[PDB]
mmCIF file of C-alpha atoms and ligand atoms in Angstrom:
data_model
loop_
_atom_site.group_PDB
_atom_site.id
_atom_site.type_symbol
_atom_site.label_atom_id
_atom_site.label_comp_id
_atom_site.label_asym_id
_atom_site.label_seq_id
_atom_site.Cartn_x
_atom_site.Cartn_y
_atom_site.Cartn_z
ATOM 1 C CA UNK A 1 34.128 -26.292 40.523
ATOM 2 C CA UNK A 2 32.050 -29.430 39.941
ATOM 3 C CA UNK A 3 29.323 -30.058 42.493
ATOM 4 C CA UNK A 4 25.652 -30.089 43.427
ATOM 5 C CA UNK A 5 23.557 -26.956 42.929
ATOM 6 C CA UNK A 6 21.808 -25.755 46.060
ATOM 7 C CA UNK A 7 20.486 -22.647 47.790
ATOM 8 C CA UNK A 8 22.017 -20.930 50.786
ATOM 9 C CA UNK A 9 20.903 -18.028 52.949
ATOM 10 C CA UNK A 10 22.727 -14.902 54.008
ATOM 11 C CA UNK A 11 22.590 -11.246 54.934
ATOM 12 C CA UNK A 12 23.727 -8.407 52.701
ATOM 13 C CA UNK A 13 25.643 -5.203 53.403
ATOM 14 C CA UNK A 14 22.457 -3.391 54.432
ATOM 15 C CA UNK A 15 21.462 -6.185 56.807
ATOM 16 C CA UNK A 16 18.743 -7.659 54.595
ATOM 17 C CA UNK A 17 18.308 -11.432 54.363
ATOM 18 C CA UNK A 18 18.302 -13.123 50.960
ATOM 19 C CA UNK A 19 18.678 -16.546 49.369
ATOM 20 C CA UNK A 20 21.666 -17.152 47.099
ATOM 21 C CA UNK A 21 22.510 -19.913 44.633
ATOM 22 C CA UNK A 22 25.519 -21.961 45.720
ATOM 23 C CA UNK A 23 27.338 -25.160 44.747
ATOM 24 C CA UNK A 24 28.176 -27.998 47.117
ATOM 25 C CA UNK A 25 31.415 -29.989 46.943
ATOM 26 C CA UNK A 26 32.877 -30.551 50.423
ATOM 27 C CA UNK A 27 32.401 -26.810 50.953
ATOM 28 C CA UNK A 28 29.546 -24.620 49.740
ATOM 29 C CA UNK A 29 30.831 -22.188 47.120
ATOM 30 C CA UNK A 30 29.447 -18.928 45.791
ATOM 31 C CA UNK A 31 28.899 -20.428 42.365
ATOM 32 C CA UNK A 32 25.501 -20.005 40.736
ATOM 33 C CA UNK A 33 24.944 -22.640 38.035
ATOM 34 C CA UNK A 34 21.414 -21.472 37.228
ATOM 35 C CA UNK A 35 22.484 -18.524 35.080
ATOM 36 C CA UNK A 36 24.382 -19.004 31.826
ATOM 37 C CA UNK A 37 27.854 -20.452 32.300
ATOM 38 C CA UNK A 38 27.652 -19.384 35.931
ATOM 39 C CA UNK A 39 28.172 -16.544 38.384
ATOM 40 C CA UNK A 40 31.300 -16.841 40.543
ATOM 41 C CA UNK A 41 32.220 -14.708 43.547
ATOM 42 C CA UNK A 42 35.759 -14.586 44.951
ATOM 43 C CA UNK A 43 37.463 -13.428 48.133
ATOM 44 C CA UNK A 44 40.341 -11.012 47.390
ATOM 45 C CA UNK A 45 41.279 -11.105 51.095
ATOM 46 C CA UNK A 46 42.211 -7.401 51.275
ATOM 47 C CA UNK A 47 44.906 -7.918 48.616
ATOM 48 C CA UNK A 48 45.054 -6.587 45.047
ATOM 49 C CA UNK A 49 45.841 -9.909 43.379
ATOM 50 C CA UNK A 50 42.910 -11.105 41.268
ATOM 51 C CA UNK A 51 40.614 -12.878 41.293
ATOM 52 C CA UNK A 52 41.525 -14.384 44.644
ATOM 53 C CA UNK A 53 39.891 -17.571 45.925
ATOM 54 C CA UNK A 54 36.435 -18.830 44.956
ATOM 55 C CA UNK A 55 34.300 -18.110 48.026
ATOM 56 C CA UNK A 56 34.000 -21.241 50.170
ATOM 57 C CA UNK A 57 31.715 -21.591 53.191
ATOM 58 C CA UNK A 58 31.348 -24.541 55.560
ATOM 59 C CA UNK A 59 27.595 -24.464 56.261
ATOM 60 C CA UNK A 60 25.837 -22.601 53.416
ATOM 61 C CA UNK A 61 24.848 -19.835 55.849
ATOM 62 C CA UNK A 62 26.332 -16.395 55.196
ATOM 63 C CA UNK A 63 25.536 -14.225 58.223
ATOM 64 C CA UNK A 64 29.076 -13.155 59.172
ATOM 65 C CA UNK A 65 29.986 -9.493 58.685
ATOM 66 C CA UNK A 66 32.838 -10.608 56.413
ATOM 67 C CA UNK A 67 30.274 -12.433 54.237
ATOM 68 C CA UNK A 68 28.004 -9.432 53.540
ATOM 69 C CA UNK A 69 29.841 -7.950 50.514
ATOM 70 C CA UNK A 70 30.059 -11.399 48.891
ATOM 71 C CA UNK A 71 26.366 -12.132 49.413
ATOM 72 C CA UNK A 72 25.357 -8.908 47.667
ATOM 73 C CA UNK A 73 27.918 -9.094 44.861
ATOM 74 C CA UNK A 74 26.728 -12.621 44.108
ATOM 75 C CA UNK A 75 23.022 -11.839 44.415
ATOM 76 C CA UNK A 76 22.977 -8.558 42.490
ATOM 77 C CA UNK A 77 25.041 -9.993 39.650
ATOM 78 C CA UNK A 78 22.254 -12.552 39.360
ATOM 79 C CA UNK A 79 19.562 -9.867 39.297
ATOM 80 C CA UNK A 80 21.444 -7.937 36.614
ATOM 81 C CA UNK A 81 21.838 -11.094 34.522
ATOM 82 C CA UNK A 82 18.074 -11.669 34.828
ATOM 83 C CA UNK A 83 17.345 -8.102 33.735
ATOM 84 C CA UNK A 84 19.384 -8.354 30.544
ATOM 85 C CA UNK A 85 18.003 -11.799 29.742
ATOM 86 C CA UNK A 86 14.318 -11.138 30.442
ATOM 87 C CA UNK A 87 14.073 -7.535 29.245
ATOM 88 C CA UNK A 88 16.561 -7.389 26.359
ATOM 89 C CA UNK A 89 16.980 -11.063 25.477
ATOM 90 C CA UNK A 90 20.725 -10.802 26.045
ATOM 91 C CA UNK A 91 22.584 -13.761 27.555
ATOM 92 C CA UNK A 92 25.223 -12.380 29.930
ATOM 93 C CA UNK A 93 27.484 -9.478 28.956
ATOM 94 C CA UNK A 94 28.882 -11.045 25.774
ATOM 95 C CA UNK A 95 25.538 -12.337 24.536
ATOM 96 C CA UNK A 96 26.840 -15.897 24.727
ATOM 97 C CA UNK A 97 26.347 -16.628 28.437
ATOM 98 C CA UNK A 98 29.904 -15.773 29.491
ATOM 99 C CA UNK A 99 30.607 -16.602 33.143
ATOM 100 C CA UNK A 100 30.307 -13.588 35.448
ATOM 101 C CA UNK A 101 33.071 -13.220 38.032
ATOM 102 C CA UNK A 102 33.290 -10.792 40.954
ATOM 103 C CA UNK A 103 35.907 -10.340 43.670
ATOM 104 C CA UNK A 104 35.094 -8.604 46.960
ATOM 105 C CA UNK A 105 37.275 -7.333 49.817
ATOM 106 C CA UNK A 106 39.660 -5.854 47.260
ATOM 107 C CA UNK A 107 42.534 -3.967 48.927
ATOM 108 C CA UNK A 108 42.002 -2.032 52.184
ATOM 109 C CA UNK A 109 39.601 0.878 52.591
ATOM 110 C CA UNK A 110 39.164 0.994 48.817
ATOM 111 C CA UNK A 111 36.419 3.451 47.813
ATOM 112 C CA UNK A 112 35.831 2.105 44.348
ATOM 113 C CA UNK A 113 34.374 -0.703 42.233
ATOM 114 C CA UNK A 114 35.344 -1.495 38.649
ATOM 115 C CA UNK A 115 35.304 -3.802 35.635
ATOM 116 C CA UNK A 116 38.933 -4.664 34.824
ATOM 117 C CA UNK A 117 38.211 -6.013 31.354
ATOM 118 C CA UNK A 118 37.645 -9.553 32.635
ATOM 119 C CA UNK A 119 35.728 -9.320 35.922
ATOM 120 C CA UNK A 120 34.100 -7.037 38.476
ATOM 121 C CA UNK A 121 36.000 -5.873 41.557
ATOM 122 C CA UNK A 122 34.568 -4.311 44.736
ATOM 123 C CA UNK A 123 36.352 -2.462 47.515
ATOM 124 C CA UNK A 124 34.973 -2.377 51.078
ATOM 125 C CA UNK A 125 35.071 1.410 51.280
ATOM 126 C CA UNK A 126 36.671 3.324 54.151
ATOM 127 C CA UNK A 127 33.491 3.273 56.214
ATOM 128 C CA UNK A 128 33.147 7.046 55.886
ATOM 129 C CA UNK A 129 32.800 7.834 52.192
ATOM 130 C CA UNK A 130 31.578 4.349 51.291
ATOM 131 C CA UNK A 131 30.548 1.060 52.863
ATOM 132 C CA UNK A 132 31.146 -2.139 50.801
ATOM 133 C CA UNK A 133 30.270 -1.110 47.237
ATOM 134 C CA UNK A 134 28.494 -4.327 46.228
ATOM 135 C CA UNK A 135 25.723 -3.256 48.603
ATOM 136 C CA UNK A 136 24.315 -0.971 45.933
ATOM 137 C CA UNK A 137 22.367 -2.645 43.151
ATOM 138 C CA UNK A 138 22.884 0.366 40.882
ATOM 139 C CA UNK A 139 26.637 0.068 41.529
ATOM 140 C CA UNK A 140 26.732 -3.617 40.567
ATOM 141 C CA UNK A 141 24.554 -3.036 37.494
ATOM 142 C CA UNK A 142 26.685 -0.015 36.553
ATOM 143 C CA UNK A 143 29.800 -2.214 36.574
ATOM 144 C CA UNK A 144 28.300 -5.173 34.719
ATOM 145 C CA UNK A 145 27.008 -2.741 32.101
ATOM 146 C CA UNK A 146 30.598 -1.610 31.438
ATOM 147 C CA UNK A 147 31.189 -5.207 30.341
ATOM 148 C CA UNK A 148 28.148 -5.094 28.043
ATOM 149 C CA UNK A 149 29.400 -1.857 26.492
ATOM 150 C CA UNK A 150 32.887 -3.307 25.965
ATOM 151 C CA UNK A 151 31.404 -6.235 24.034
ATOM 152 C CA UNK A 152 29.072 -4.105 21.945
ATOM 153 C CA UNK A 153 29.712 -0.440 21.108
ATOM 154 C CA UNK A 154 33.203 -0.533 22.626
ATOM 155 C CA UNK A 155 33.082 3.154 23.572
ATOM 156 C CA UNK A 156 36.613 4.400 24.289
ATOM 157 C CA UNK A 157 36.970 5.541 27.908
ATOM 158 C CA UNK A 158 37.966 9.114 27.123
ATOM 159 C CA UNK A 159 36.296 12.464 26.413
ATOM 160 C CA UNK A 160 32.784 12.345 24.948
ATOM 161 C CA UNK A 161 32.770 8.647 24.062
ATOM 162 C CA UNK A 162 33.844 7.941 27.639
ATOM 163 C CA UNK A 163 31.079 10.138 29.036
ATOM 164 C CA UNK A 164 28.562 8.167 26.970
ATOM 165 C CA UNK A 165 30.131 4.964 28.264
ATOM 166 C CA UNK A 166 29.584 6.247 31.811
ATOM 167 C CA UNK A 167 26.022 7.460 31.211
ATOM 168 C CA UNK A 168 25.063 4.092 29.710
ATOM 169 C CA UNK A 169 26.242 2.404 32.915
ATOM 170 C CA UNK A 170 24.282 4.856 35.097
ATOM 171 C CA UNK A 171 21.188 4.511 32.919
ATOM 172 C CA UNK A 172 21.061 0.724 32.995
ATOM 173 C CA UNK A 173 22.251 0.661 36.588
ATOM 174 C CA UNK A 174 19.149 2.690 37.390
ATOM 175 C CA UNK A 175 16.854 0.599 35.188
ATOM 176 C CA UNK A 176 18.048 -2.540 36.978
ATOM 177 C CA UNK A 177 17.378 -0.866 40.331
ATOM 178 C CA UNK A 178 13.803 -0.241 39.137
ATOM 179 C CA UNK A 179 13.587 -3.792 37.774
ATOM 180 C CA UNK A 180 14.415 -5.192 41.215
ATOM 181 C CA UNK A 181 12.060 -2.634 42.776
ATOM 182 C CA UNK A 182 14.604 -2.011 45.544
ATOM 183 C CA UNK A 183 13.667 1.497 46.748
ATOM 184 C CA UNK A 184 14.171 2.739 43.154
ATOM 185 C CA UNK A 185 15.229 6.291 42.333
ATOM 186 C CA UNK A 186 17.177 8.298 39.757
ATOM 187 C CA UNK A 187 20.161 8.767 42.071
ATOM 188 C CA UNK A 188 23.433 6.834 41.822
ATOM 189 C CA UNK A 189 25.041 4.931 44.697
ATOM 190 C CA UNK A 190 22.766 6.249 47.438
ATOM 191 C CA UNK A 191 22.717 2.922 49.299
ATOM 192 C CA UNK A 192 26.466 2.734 49.918
ATOM 193 C CA UNK A 193 27.511 6.390 49.875
ATOM 194 C CA UNK A 194 28.281 8.324 53.093
ATOM 195 C CA UNK A 195 26.582 6.151 55.741
ATOM 196 C CA UNK A 196 26.693 9.113 58.121
ATOM 197 C CA UNK A 197 24.643 11.331 55.799
ATOM 198 C CA UNK A 198 21.149 10.439 54.592
ATOM 199 C CA UNK A 199 19.428 11.692 51.460
ATOM 200 C CA UNK A 200 22.559 12.141 49.349
ATOM 201 C CA UNK A 201 24.269 10.181 46.572
ATOM 202 C CA UNK A 202 27.347 10.250 44.355
ATOM 203 C CA UNK A 203 25.500 11.408 41.239
ATOM 204 C CA UNK A 204 21.973 12.463 40.338
ATOM 205 C CA UNK A 205 20.319 11.730 37.000
ATOM 206 C CA UNK A 206 17.246 13.840 37.761
ATOM 207 C CA UNK A 207 19.370 16.858 38.696
ATOM 208 C CA UNK A 208 23.112 16.404 37.968
ATOM 209 C CA UNK A 209 23.815 20.010 38.987
ATOM 210 C CA UNK A 210 22.885 19.112 42.562
ATOM 211 C CA UNK A 211 26.403 17.703 42.920
ATOM 212 C CA UNK A 212 28.134 20.091 40.541
ATOM 213 C CA UNK A 213 27.832 18.020 37.368
ATOM 214 C CA UNK A 214 26.754 19.684 34.081
ATOM 215 C CA UNK A 215 23.130 19.384 32.941
ATOM 216 C CA UNK A 216 23.591 21.164 29.606
ATOM 217 C CA UNK A 217 26.190 20.875 26.832
ATOM 218 C CA UNK A 218 27.247 24.509 27.296
ATOM 219 C CA UNK A 219 28.510 23.589 30.768
ATOM 220 C CA UNK A 220 30.568 20.579 29.670
ATOM 221 C CA UNK A 221 33.997 20.044 31.213
ATOM 222 C CA UNK A 222 36.810 20.477 28.687
ATOM 223 C CA UNK A 223 39.820 19.712 30.884
ATOM 224 C CA UNK A 224 42.036 16.628 31.087
ATOM 225 C CA UNK A 225 41.104 15.337 34.546
ATOM 226 C CA UNK A 226 39.037 12.158 34.894
ATOM 227 C CA UNK A 227 39.941 11.084 31.343
ATOM 228 C CA UNK A 228 38.353 14.232 29.971
ATOM 229 C CA UNK A 229 35.542 14.318 32.518
ATOM 230 C CA UNK A 230 33.943 10.949 31.800
ATOM 231 C CA UNK A 231 32.224 10.923 35.209
ATOM 232 C CA UNK A 232 31.409 14.630 34.928
ATOM 233 C CA UNK A 233 30.003 15.089 31.430
ATOM 234 C CA UNK A 234 27.949 11.911 31.813
ATOM 235 C CA UNK A 235 25.547 14.203 33.654
ATOM 236 C CA UNK A 236 24.500 15.786 30.359
ATOM 237 C CA UNK A 237 23.434 12.426 28.963
ATOM 238 C CA UNK A 238 21.970 11.232 32.274
ATOM 239 C CA UNK A 239 19.726 14.305 32.347
ATOM 240 C CA UNK A 240 18.608 13.627 28.778
ATOM 241 C CA UNK A 241 17.768 10.018 29.673
ATOM 242 C CA UNK A 242 15.836 11.165 32.750
ATOM 243 C CA UNK A 243 13.830 13.622 30.641
ATOM 244 C CA UNK A 244 13.039 11.021 27.978
ATOM 245 C CA UNK A 245 11.617 8.738 30.662
ATOM 246 C CA UNK A 246 10.015 11.138 33.141
ATOM 247 C CA UNK A 247 9.495 14.248 31.042
ATOM 248 C CA UNK A 248 9.740 17.823 32.250
ATOM 249 C CA UNK A 249 10.886 21.291 31.244
ATOM 250 C CA UNK A 250 14.622 21.941 31.241
ATOM 251 C CA UNK A 251 16.108 25.301 30.227
ATOM 252 C CA UNK A 252 12.790 26.289 28.684
ATOM 253 C CA UNK A 253 12.406 23.123 26.616
ATOM 254 C CA UNK A 254 9.444 20.862 27.405
ATOM 255 C CA UNK A 255 9.724 17.092 27.072
ATOM 256 C CA UNK A 256 6.874 14.581 27.230
ATOM 257 C CA UNK A 257 8.028 11.478 29.098
ATOM 258 C CA UNK A 258 7.592 8.055 27.504
ATOM 259 C CA UNK A 259 8.521 5.861 30.472
ATOM 260 C CA UNK A 260 11.403 3.672 31.652
ATOM 261 C CA UNK A 261 10.637 0.633 29.510
ATOM 262 C CA UNK A 262 10.825 2.572 26.247
ATOM 263 C CA UNK A 263 13.918 4.430 27.472
ATOM 264 C CA UNK A 264 15.613 1.071 27.978
ATOM 265 C CA UNK A 265 14.557 -0.249 24.578
ATOM 266 C CA UNK A 266 15.745 2.884 22.779
ATOM 267 C CA UNK A 267 19.147 3.046 24.465
ATOM 268 C CA UNK A 268 19.799 -0.693 24.313
ATOM 269 C CA UNK A 269 19.192 -0.649 20.563
ATOM 270 C CA UNK A 270 21.408 2.418 20.144
ATOM 271 C CA UNK A 271 24.155 0.754 22.177
ATOM 272 C CA UNK A 272 24.056 -2.571 20.341
ATOM 273 C CA UNK A 273 23.259 -1.441 16.792
ATOM 274 C CA UNK A 274 24.458 2.106 16.147
ATOM 275 C CA UNK A 275 27.148 3.287 18.555
ATOM 276 C CA UNK A 276 30.838 2.796 17.769
ATOM 277 C CA UNK A 277 34.066 3.165 19.797
ATOM 278 C CA UNK A 278 34.472 6.856 18.915
ATOM 279 C CA UNK A 279 30.848 8.036 19.014
ATOM 280 C CA UNK A 280 30.374 11.544 20.432
ATOM 281 C CA UNK A 281 27.276 13.210 21.932
ATOM 282 C CA UNK A 282 25.952 14.361 18.559
ATOM 283 C CA UNK A 283 26.240 10.840 17.177
ATOM 284 C CA UNK A 284 24.531 9.468 20.289
ATOM 285 C CA UNK A 285 21.591 11.758 19.554
ATOM 286 C CA UNK A 286 21.448 10.480 15.968
ATOM 287 C CA UNK A 287 21.674 6.869 17.154
ATOM 288 C CA UNK A 288 18.909 7.355 19.728
ATOM 289 C CA UNK A 289 16.640 9.047 17.195
ATOM 290 C CA UNK A 290 17.233 6.267 14.674
ATOM 291 C CA UNK A 291 16.587 3.616 17.324
ATOM 292 C CA UNK A 292 13.311 5.220 18.379
ATOM 293 C CA UNK A 293 12.425 5.483 14.691
ATOM 294 C CA UNK A 294 13.082 1.768 14.108
ATOM 295 C CA UNK A 295 10.941 0.836 17.091
ATOM 296 C CA UNK A 296 8.068 3.323 16.996
ATOM 297 C CA UNK A 297 8.061 5.125 13.649
ATOM 298 C CA UNK A 298 9.453 8.450 12.437
ATOM 299 C CA UNK A 299 6.284 10.366 13.366
ATOM 300 C CA UNK A 300 5.845 8.816 16.812
ATOM 301 C CA UNK A 301 5.710 10.604 20.154
ATOM 302 C CA UNK A 302 8.730 8.506 21.144
ATOM 303 C CA UNK A 303 10.947 10.012 18.444
ATOM 304 C CA UNK A 304 9.607 13.467 19.293
ATOM 305 C CA UNK A 305 10.529 13.074 22.968
ATOM 306 C CA UNK A 306 14.051 11.866 22.189
ATOM 307 C CA UNK A 307 14.614 14.949 20.027
ATOM 308 C CA UNK A 308 13.201 17.290 22.686
ATOM 309 C CA UNK A 309 15.329 15.747 25.440
ATOM 310 C CA UNK A 310 18.571 16.255 23.545
ATOM 311 C CA UNK A 311 17.493 19.778 22.554
ATOM 312 C CA UNK A 312 16.892 20.466 26.244
ATOM 313 C CA UNK A 313 20.479 19.541 27.141
ATOM 314 C CA UNK A 314 21.930 21.405 24.169
ATOM 315 C CA UNK A 315 23.072 18.405 22.135
ATOM 316 C CA UNK A 316 22.537 18.869 18.394
HETATM 317 CA CA1 CA B 401 28.883 -19.891 56.997
HETATM 318 CA CA1 CA B 402 17.584 3.467 45.569
HETATM 319 CA CA1 CA B 403 19.937 4.504 42.790
HETATM 320 CA CA1 CA B 404 24.707 8.871 52.438
HETATM 321 ZN ZN1 ZN B 405 31.622 3.548 35.325
#
């Protein structure tokens, strides 16, 4: 809507207080005009009809329990936008400042979040497996990254290309978590997963096997479930990304880490310049090697580490 830009205050899913950009026009709306064509957050009101109603508040104060998921979805979308703009010089997910829209309170006891091709959607969780999903910055970044992938490489959501699609979202979801310096780690969804159990997460990039996911190509899932194991085989790529950044010895192969910043630069270039809709793991390796070559030279330590990491996970 058309109004005056202002700043409100609220509390997120985890009970933390934060300032959020709103717009005033009779009501205060969750509309951030400071980033691109705007960030809009909607109330799905426990229904499945999208996007729902643009979030309206009477006093610009968002401390109600019902407000929490909206505060975080709105705020973290902003952080993710800042990451892509400041670190990769990319304006929104389409590179042309497309408006970012998110709907919260989707359905009832919905343990999932997703990009539906046009916007982000967040369930509130069942309170046992998950609490409102927008409470996790890596979750929000994971979802917004699916949009970036759709507008760039366009990786098909099936089999190996789908696993790469998933890994890319976990990788950048994690880099954004580090960017915001919000208790950063190489785990996925730890902030909103199983509130009754501490120390766990949905997936682990440092050690995928911890939750039963493969950490080597020889252990890849070949079945038909989960679109060919897109959320399972992503572990192979996640492990490779972790090794490239942090280094380590995996299955007898030693990798010298080059850090998170270079990891981001290498994968972002691969994603936007070399990957295609049907790229498989082997092609991802080639794309990553070429990207590192473009950025640091064919005889650089960076290229060496990328090669070692993929060798470690059995991807030739
Ligand atoms: Ca209020
Ligand atoms: Ca964390
Ligand atoms: Ca995390
Ligand atoms: Ca937990
Ligand atoms: Zn995903």
